[PDB]
Amino acid sequence: QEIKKLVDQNFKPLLEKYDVPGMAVGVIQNNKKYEMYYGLQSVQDKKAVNSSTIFELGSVSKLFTATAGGYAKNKGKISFDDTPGKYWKELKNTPIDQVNLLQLATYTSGNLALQFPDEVKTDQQVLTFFKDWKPKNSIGEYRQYSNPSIGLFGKVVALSMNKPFDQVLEKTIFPALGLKHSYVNVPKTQMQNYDFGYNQENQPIRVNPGPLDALAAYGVKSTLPDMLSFIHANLNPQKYPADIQRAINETHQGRYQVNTMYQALGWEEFSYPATLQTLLDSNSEQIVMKPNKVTAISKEPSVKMYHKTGSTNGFGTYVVFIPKENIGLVMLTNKRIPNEERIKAAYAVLNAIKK
């Protein structure tokens, strides 16, 4: 059916249900990008949420970190066999130097939790944290979703490219993807487009930023048109120059499975058609918060789909795409809503515009 009708039926009611100030929903189908905006970027200013509004992607940032890692790997700047001390020399001869880069990128070091400790903020505190790290579970065998893990991966990628991570994205990866308003650090010239998001009590929220390396885990900001372009790049990598094409495709390869979920670089991958329950289970407390023993991949699914949720204190994100149907969807909000609502609403929309 018409995309607007399906988005109105499935996404629009979430604004009233969760008191969300503004939502941007994009659908790409047959290489045509459709944008739908509801509500306000700023409640106080009566400023409509729009195609220039900048949203925090939360953990969808990890898809850009993955793309940077795929870009570096396919240019020979890193091997996924390498360990972090080859690039971050102060980690040589430490226990974390037994973990390879793929294991860090896919959360299988065996002893890294969701967040850095609160007291770890400066670059020295991060280095000391990794120098003091010791193994717990067998390396490679257990997935524990982890911002420090992919943060160390991103730091190594940046070192291998002789640029800080913010510049890896802003000077290399974002331009190669054709993104015009995606940032690690939003400049003052974009201030009118980047308002605080809203906490659960509808108050504009900010916190002090955490360690710089965690920007690779949750620190990217973008707009709906740029996210639609990023989905287009994931659906149609042959339209892009060869180096970024290789980087995008690197992020699609499953590295191991946990139940019905395959862990790719950044992306979560599923056999397609996937049931709603499979997609919901990927965001369950068991998978997101607890360690789970991985299963090596023997047969990667021949027909696949991919998704990722992201959240920050003030913002919600969901992205999903299905190569066989040549369709994808992006949802951005300036207030968190439950992941299950994001996944269900996207499932209802994409299931009806299949072709």
Query: Catalytic residue numbers?
Result: 59
310 touches ligand YDB (CB under 6 A): yes
Indicate which single residue of 51, 74, 313, 326 sits in contact with ligand YDB (rule: CB under 6 A): 313
Indicate which single residue of 1, 134, 201, 207 sits in contact with ligand YDB (rule: CB under 6 A): 207
Site track for ligand YDB across 33-72, x = CB under 6 A: -------------------------xx-------------
Binding window for ligand YDB (CB under 6 A); candidates: 70-78, 104-112, 267-275, 306-314: 306-314
Measured in whole angstroms, the distance separating CA 74 from the mean position of its chain's CA atoms is: 20
146 touches ligand YDB (CB under 6 A): no
Q: In terms of CB distance, is 50 or 313 closer to ligand YDB?
A: 313
Using CB under 6 A as the binding criterion, the count of chain residues that bind ligand YDB stands at 11
Q: In terms of CB distance, is 84 or 316 closer to ligand YDB?
A: 316
Q: In terms of CB distance, is 319 or 322 closer to ligand YDB?
A: 319
Shortest CB 246 distance to ligand YDB, Å? 26
Q: In terms of CB distance, is 246 or 344 closer to ligand YDB?
A: 344
Backbone conformation region of residue 259, classed left if phi is above 0, alpha if psi is from -120 to 50, else beta: left
Binding window for ligand YDB (CB under 6 A); candidates: 44-52, 88-96, 148-156, 309-317: 309-317
Q: How far apart are CA 113 and CA 90, in angstroms?
A: 22
Q: How far apart are CA 329 and CA 6, in angstroms?
A: 12
Binding window for ligand YDB (CB under 6 A); candidates: 116-124, 136-144, 304-312, 320-328: 304-312
Residue type, 162: N
Tokens of 141: 């065998």
Shortest CB 82 distance to ligand YDB, Å? 26
26 touches ligand YDB (CB under 6 A): no
318 touches ligand YDB (CB under 6 A): no
Binding window for ligand YDB (CB under 6 A); candidates: 65-73, 247-255, 299-307, 308-316: 308-316
Tokens of 258: 């946990």
154 touches ligand YDB (CB under 6 A): no
263 touches ligand YDB (CB under 6 A): no
Indicate which single residue of 312, 325, 327, 335 sits in contact with ligand YDB (rule: CB under 6 A): 312
Tokens of 314: 């003030």
Binding residues among 216-235 for ligand YDB as defined by CB under 6 A: 218
Residues that bind ligand YDB (CB under 6 A): 58-59, 147, 207, 218, 310-313, 336, 339
